[PDB]
Amino acid sequence: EVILVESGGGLVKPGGSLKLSCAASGFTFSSYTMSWVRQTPEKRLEWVATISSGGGNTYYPDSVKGRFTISRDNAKNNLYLQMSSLRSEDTALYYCARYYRYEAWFASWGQGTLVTVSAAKTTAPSVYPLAPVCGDTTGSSVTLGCLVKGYFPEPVTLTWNSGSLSSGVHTFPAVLQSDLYTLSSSVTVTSSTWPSQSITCNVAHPASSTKVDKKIEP
Amino acid sequence: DVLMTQTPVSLSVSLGDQASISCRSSQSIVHSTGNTYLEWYLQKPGQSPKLLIYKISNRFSGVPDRFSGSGSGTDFTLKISRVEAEDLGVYYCFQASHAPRTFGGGTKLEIKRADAAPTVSIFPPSSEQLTSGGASVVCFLNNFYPKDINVKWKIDGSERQNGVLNSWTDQDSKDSTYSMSSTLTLTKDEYERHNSYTCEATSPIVKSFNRNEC
Amino acid sequence: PTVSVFSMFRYSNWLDKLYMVVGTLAAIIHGAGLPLMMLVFGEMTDIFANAGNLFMNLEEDMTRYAYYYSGIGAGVLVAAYIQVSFWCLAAGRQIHKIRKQFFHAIMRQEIGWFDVHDVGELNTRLTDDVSKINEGIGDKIGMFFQSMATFFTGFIVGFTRGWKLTLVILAISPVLGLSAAVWAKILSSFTDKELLAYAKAGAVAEEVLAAIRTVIAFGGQKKELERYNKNLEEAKRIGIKKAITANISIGAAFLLIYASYALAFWYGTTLVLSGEYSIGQVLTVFFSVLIGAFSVGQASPSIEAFANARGAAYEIFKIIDNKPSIDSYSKSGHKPDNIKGNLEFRNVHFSYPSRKEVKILKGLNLKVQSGQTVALVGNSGCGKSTTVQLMQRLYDPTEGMVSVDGQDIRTINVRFLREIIGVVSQEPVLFATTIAENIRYGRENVTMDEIEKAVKEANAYDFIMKLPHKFDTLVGERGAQLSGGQKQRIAIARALVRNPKILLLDEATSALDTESEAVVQVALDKARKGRTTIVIAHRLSTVRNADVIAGFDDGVIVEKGNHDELMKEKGIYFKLVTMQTPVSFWRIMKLNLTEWPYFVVGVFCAIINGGLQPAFAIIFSKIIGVFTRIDDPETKRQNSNLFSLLFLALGIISFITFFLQGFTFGKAGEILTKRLRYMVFRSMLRQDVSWFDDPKNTTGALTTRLANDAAQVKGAIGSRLAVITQNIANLGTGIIISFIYGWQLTLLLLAIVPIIAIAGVVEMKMLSGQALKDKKELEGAGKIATEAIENFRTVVSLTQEQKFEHMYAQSLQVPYRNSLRKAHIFGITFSFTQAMMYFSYAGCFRFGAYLVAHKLMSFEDVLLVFSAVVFGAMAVGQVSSFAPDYAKAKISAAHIIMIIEKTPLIDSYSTEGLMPNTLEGNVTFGEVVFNYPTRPDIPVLQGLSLEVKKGQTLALVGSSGCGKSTVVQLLERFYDPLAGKVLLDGKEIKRLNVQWLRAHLGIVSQEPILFDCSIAENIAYGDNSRVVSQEEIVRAAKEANIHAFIESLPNKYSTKVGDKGTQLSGGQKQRIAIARALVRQPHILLLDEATSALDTESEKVVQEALDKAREGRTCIVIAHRLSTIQNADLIVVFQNGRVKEHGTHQQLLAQKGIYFSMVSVQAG
Ligand SMILES: O[C@@H](COc1cccc2ncccc12)CN1CCN([C@@H]2c3ccccc3[C@@H]3[C@H](c4ccccc42)C3(F)F)CC1
Ligand SMILES: O[C@@H](COc1cccc2ncccc12)CN1CCN([C@@H]2c3ccccc3[C@@H]3[C@H](c4ccccc42)C3(F)F)CC1
Ligand SMILES: CC(C)CCC[C@@H](C)[C@H]1CC[C@H]2[C@@H]3CC=C4C[C@@H](O)CC[C@]4(C)[C@H]3CC[C@]12C
Ligand SMILES: CC(C)CCC[C@@H](C)[C@H]1CC[C@H]2[C@@H]3CC=C4C[C@@H](O)CC[C@]4(C)[C@H]3CC[C@]12C
Ligand SMILES: CC(C)CCC[C@@H](C)[C@H]1CC[C@H]2[C@@H]3CC=C4C[C@@H](O)CC[C@]4(C)[C@H]3CC[C@]12C
Ligand SMILES: CC(C)CCC[C@@H](C)[C@H]1CC[C@H]2[C@@H]3CC=C4C[C@@H](O)CC[C@]4(C)[C@H]3CC[C@]12C
Ligand SMILES: CC(C)CCC[C@@H](C)[C@H]1CC[C@H]2[C@@H]3CC=C4C[C@@H](O)CC[C@]4(C)[C@H]3CC[C@]12C
Ligand SMILES: CC(C)CCC[C@@H](C)[C@H]1CC[C@H]2[C@@H]3CC=C4C[C@@H](O)CC[C@]4(C)[C@H]3CC[C@]12C
Ligand SMILES: CC(C)CCC[C@@H](C)[C@H]1CC[C@H]2[C@@H]3CC=C4C[C@@H](O)CC[C@]4(C)[C@H]3CC[C@]12C
Ligand SMILES: CC(C)CCC[C@@H](C)[C@H]1CC[C@H]2[C@@H]3CC=C4C[C@@H](O)CC[C@]4(C)[C@H]3CC[C@]12C
């Protein structure tokens, strides 16, 4: 189908400069108006830029003009947004977006690429396991935890068994406190698997090239 | 500019009922051509929003017939009949008539669910953060309703240590339930000053871990 | 002066009525092909702009659409063929009938259509006129209906699809139709407008050429060339203004096309964007209504040519209706059979139908039985010839009647009458026929036996034996290859073979030799017993045998009776008898090297205007791409606005570049032709008369060169670069931009453009003139008509008009047949190529459906490739046909440069020769032989000798052309002999100067010839290149009693004379020419036929201009009547080369000879 995948975001110093890219496959990229939209961490969307189907025309709102510059490359099917002199209010998650005939504005989005803009220092996580003392089962379902704490910036992946289990998971969003994010997850496994198949709490930090797959035990 | 408001914020809809979400513009939305663009967007927890209905009264290819949109001038409304758990998120009324395009605030849709007591569960800390100087204990107040609930930690019975890092969650799409996490952190010195710990929810639903290693 | 529409198509039968109705329907269906095509195209663009988006079934939709295009293409093939052919066959049949019928009525017309209605003008009112009707009712009326159809169909489509944009494209439609109308008029017959500026100058060019010898003899090149140059600069100005106007017209047409594009798209995008219309709906409505609004302007020249058609058919029809009172296609006159010959004249008066004011005849009465011969004596022009005419009922009396054999001819048939009578006129002429037929002219059944019999009878059998091709030699025109003896003998024999009954002769022995005159007369006399005869002669040898002798005074016969009757009277005839007893050349750009800034700006604007078409292709493809892509309303609006603005700017640049290219190439062309005609003429007045005699070098050929050369070289220098550079910019950019946008489709569709380019060129020729109209085949038929036309009255009495009527028809049959076939041939080529255009939208677009379905290109890529090669080949054709031909023009420039570089044997401008200080005035001739370079076989003089001294008035007299025109051009150096020796005071004129000779002496010609100037001019013209005094004119003008008639006429010395002497008579002009060289004050006096047309009381004041000025000059007077010769000092009579006599007068009188008779005509 129409698959858009973006990349290029990470921690930046104010007044800095960054370049997001959005690679699109599955349609005739050289025919569709394309927009960039942004969602701030109060969860309130905001239009950020537009570019027509050949690159000629381009439209920005009245609070971004001059800094941002959006452009495209029809040969490789790429859409770039080069931002300069970033502020503290431009910390937000950035979606690509396609345009739909019959005049609907954002038909097929992509996934975000978080772009934090502040004066902090990138760091790796502090991954840890969680399990009850002596591993006492409470029935046909056994609860297992995990706790990733003390990292910056926010985009962090947590998985289990590397793509196998999803049944009784409960992951909770981080809460910023003095430039360090803590993000907690849980599991639920039957009594017939945990002692037979030990569980791993995989964790990876994009901003620090970290990859720690903690095997969870009693 | 033109600022689009959305009067309802917290909707408490029950499976099978209806819902009416307004969008009351400020200037009057009419293009030079004479068309009126005002689309509705939906965001389900943890995904990119998806287009619902374009123009004023239309439906993107792939939507249910329960979604209706009627109105004129600066007043627009959206209605949903027979709400199904597959429909739960935040709704934005985009408009593209004037040269700054502006979304709207957003409406939350909280489907009604039967009350339930949270299956509380405490979690003892690993020796790893203990070796480094940290206490990793949390209390996952799972599967409850209504949305609001609190969590109390009794440190060896009397010291109700409410010193945690609350992490709110969103309504579970599947069963329309909630959850939250209460991670109790304290420096390892005063932690080992207690062997047991008793976490609860607010009648309290109890659980404890009374061991520093096994 | 116009004939109604119902009475216009009267020569059409049932077959022609079926050719007109079907051609009209066929043209009504062929004109609805363009609008219908725009209905299919606007439908195919909605398919191509909805697929690929959701390549499914897109290919299937295109194949169905392709069928529609091939269907319209085939319909248009058939309808075009029918319309063009049927309409060209209905006008090809009628015009032929009208030619035959008009010519049939022109021959059978009462005498008096040559004095009342001029005859050459009749040739222009026949050939040309007939062609004007042909162009009127011919194919043009087809074209009209077609265009009308494209009007209505257009607007009907415009109102059916969507009407909100049709009212808008209609609000401006008057201006569109007006630009189209104006452009249509400038497109059609744009090659028949080049004689407006060379009309006023043509006269001056013809006038100097008419008398080249007089200009060289009198010096007067300078002023003639100056008048020429003035005429030129005027014609040049008019030409420049016409070029400016033509290019402004085409420029305004393109400006309006493009601004209408701009408006259509600026509004249609509002409509499209508001969801109302589609883009197919806009393309259909806009294209169809625009095509309608221009194809109603294409229909202006049809009404213009129809009005011309009927405006000429009026006069033609009024000739064909004109039934003369006396004719021979009435067949009512009784046919008598008992013929005895009874001439009865009782009170016969006459006033000329040419001039009724004067009755040269005042009543006559005579009677002549059979065999009775009467001679008739009088002065030349006493109504002798005209009376011999009126005998045959060539005219009718004004009072009275003429009768024959009891009854009068006023009720009986003339054909039998005008047949049984033989009449040899004053000068009988003969046409371009064979001697068998020359004699056979009288009637039909004249056998070779009769031919040989007649050549025995008239002694006309000798040139059979001495000259080969004894019975099939082609006599010259008007009887040229023959001699006077042969002419007169075949004349009498021919007049005998017609089985005559009354034989009337006029000056029967003018030029006949001693034996020849006697044998002619006797051959005539042996046929004087069974047939009446009436003779007229000036030699009294052919009069004596007449039974009675008559005397003409005021055309009346007053003296009558036999010999002794007037020989006892002692009258006038008595007085007579008593006194008697390559390679081609390419340097032509070195002719126009000096006007290079013009060509620089011209090439630049050519390049810009040739590249404007790919620019339109790109802009159009992109302005539809604006609507295929998926954008917002606002981006579509802004790109639509910017592209509309670029359309408008393209239109404005088109206008400016067109006007500029026109200005600059037109001005270079005019400067070139002006300078070129000037130099051609200048180099023309340097060649000898021995260059100017040749009849393969005629004035008509020279006038064609002056104007035609101008046209041709102007073409093959400027228009060639204009066309090549426009076309290179055009197709070079089109092909090169297409090859890089898709090569697959361009490779296919580049195997079509030869035929689209060719299709544009053939159509263009069909649109304006270029109907072939071969006239070379027509010229042969016309030449036969011209012969009969020259002497219709003289030939009618021969009754041979039938054998000329048929000599028309049997000749007209060749081209008619041919032209018929051609109206089929052309009718297919045109049709075929038009079909090809309608087929391209089926091939290209079909292939397009393939490629767009395999993502090998895009839609707008197909639109850009198609719009830039198909429309590009159309433009290449329409441009390469709007310019003169090449190879013709190159040959014209070849001949012009061939003549420019010329260098005469003897230059009139060159100063070379002898410029002596003194002279006495002596001329001597010795063994001098003189021959033409074109006529070497016929000799004139045979090595004569003379001796003329100062003041000595030489006397010379001869018959009509025994060599008196010879000696003139020998003294004023028009001629060079190969033999002899001439000593002017011992100083040879072959060594002496040729211009210094001319400022020294001055002569007079046979007749005075004159200018379109003042009378003061020609008389002062006699001496130029020196300060002329007004008083020297009033000196000689009074000295000759010719100023007397000048001071009386208003603007005495300032009246602009008529052409060549129409405002006065001869006696008035014969003064001013002798007076012309009178002011010259020469040292040699020469006259030739100075008493030709002059009053016997002015021949004194004109000859007294000699006597008191004879002094110092070698006076050589030559006249016909000896009145002025008997006072000339020395008499040198001539006869055919040998000096007949020279010396004192009484040397000519004591020894009596041919002079003893030459003063014996009418002495008192
Ligand atoms: O090829 C171009 C340019 O031609 C030249 C360019 C530069 C120099 C030239 N110098 C001498 C002769 C032609 C020259 C002209 N076509 C000639 C033919 N049109 C045809 C056409 C056919 C029948 C009746 C009216 C029209 C006229 C326009 C039109 C609009 C939409 C689709 C086709 C056409 C319209 F309805 F107004 C297009 C332009
Ligand atoms: O070419 C043919 C065939 O017509 C087509 C048939 C089927 C498809 C076509 N597709 C594109 C173009 C023409 C198509 C039509 N001619 C086009 C040429 N007209 C001629 C002509 C001649 C020289 C320069 C420009 C023009 C053009 C109009 C015009 C206005 C007043 C008087 C005559 C004409 C103009 F000044 F605008 C009419 C006939
Ligand atoms: C004598 C020749 C050169 C005349 C040229 C005529 C051409 C242009 C005409 C003649 C028959 C026509 C074809 C008739 C049938 C077909 C097959 C179909 O699947 C697509 C259209 C197509 C291919 C037409 C295209 C145009 C066509 C090829
Ligand atoms: C005789 C001509 C050359 C005079 C010039 C008149 C032209 C410029 C005028 C005549 C009628 C006019 C149109 C009349 C109606 C409409 C619709 C309206 O909603 C916009 C203006 C528009 C599109 C006008 C455009 C300009 C127009 C075409
Ligand atoms: C055909 C005759 C009357 C010529 C006049 C008509 C054309 C040349 C005129 C009439 C209306 C004009 C348009 C009126 C307004 C606009 C909007 C502007 O932002 C772009 C140019 C544009 C689109 C103009 C282009 C020129 C235009 C199309
Ligand atoms: C005489 C020859 C050499 C001239 C060749 C002219 C060509 C190369 C020129 C003529 C007008 C030009 C166009 C004018 C305007 C624009 C619109 C813009 O949005 C794209 C480029 C485009 C379309 C230009 C491309 C180059 C162009 C097409
Ligand atoms: C395919 C590449 C080389 C593009 C270059 C195309 C050249 C070779 C083509 C484009 C248009 C053509 C010209 C079109 C018309 C004319 C006028 C004619 O009286 C002589 C041929 C002449 C002068 C052609 C010569 C060849 C030409 C110049
Ligand atoms: C005389 C000249 C101008 C005509 C040459 C013939 C043209 C029409 C022919 C010859 C070569 C052909 C191309 C050769 C190769 C291919 C690949 C084939 O799988 C699809 C069609 C395509 C793209 C052809 C299109 C038609 C083509 C361009
Ligand atoms: C190098 C090649 C592939 C370029 C393609 C050549 C085409 C564009 C050129 C080659 C020669 C040209 C033709 C040469 C002769 C004439 C005759 C003239 O009265 C009209 C134009 C016309 C009919 C030309 C049309 C265009 C033409 C066919
Ligand atoms: C010479 C041009 C302008 C007119 C004649 C074109 C006709 C004869 C040719 C041009 C392109 C051709 C098509 C080329 C390719 C395809 C696809 C193939 O799988 C079936 C035949 C089909 C559909 C051809 C049908 C005939 C066709 C339309």
Side-chain angles (χ1 to χ4, degrees), chain A residues 28 30-33 50 52-54 57-59 74 99-101 103 105, chain C residues 49-50 52-55 273 629-636 638-639 855:
Chain A
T28 318
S30 152
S31 270
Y32 295 67
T33 279
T50 298
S52 178
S53 35
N57 300 262
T58 166
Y59 307 74
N74 290 334
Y99 182 91
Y100 169 57
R101 35 173 359 195
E103 270 65 355
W105 241 262
Chain C
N50 272 3
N53 261 337
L54 176 137
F55 311 169
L273 288 181
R629 320 170 100 121
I630 288 95
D631 296 351
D632 13 341
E634 293 177 350
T635 279
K636 276 171 179 164
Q638 267 170 187
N639 304 357
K855 275 169 283 175

Side-chain angles (χ1 to χ4, degrees), chain A residues 51-70:
Chain A
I51 172 146
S52 178
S53 35
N57 300 262
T58 166
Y59 307 74
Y60 320 79
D62 285 86
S63 57
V64 125
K65 209 178 230 289
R67 311 185 258 130
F68 286 60
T69 279
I70 164 167

Side-chain angles (χ1 to χ4, degrees), chain C residues 697-767:
Chain C
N697 306 162
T698 329
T699 59
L702 292 180
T703 201
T704 306
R705 178 183 299 185
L706 286 186
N708 275 352
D709 124 274
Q712 317 275 319
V713 186
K714 126 223 168 178
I717 272 182
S719 287
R720 154 192 101 180
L721 304 198
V723 167
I724 289 188
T725 323
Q726 254 168 358
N727 285 357
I728 287 186
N730 208 298
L731 255 199
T733 293
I735 276 157
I736 289 319
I737 296 200
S738 323
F739 260 135
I740 74 198
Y741 268 98
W743 70 270
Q744 301 117 336
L745 176 50
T746 308
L747 260 188
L748 152 74
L749 164 142
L750 198 277
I752 285 326
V753 317
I755 306 163
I756 316 309
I758 298 297
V761 170
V762 294
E763 190 284 349
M764 280 297 299
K765 297 182 179 182
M766 190 292 299
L767 187 50

Side-chain angles (χ1 to χ4, degrees), chain C residues 172 256 259-260 262-263 266 641-642 644-645 648:
Chain C
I172 83 183
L256 295 174
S260 34
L263 168 69
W266 169 66
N641 280 357
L642 152 73
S644 147
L645 202 81
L648 160 65

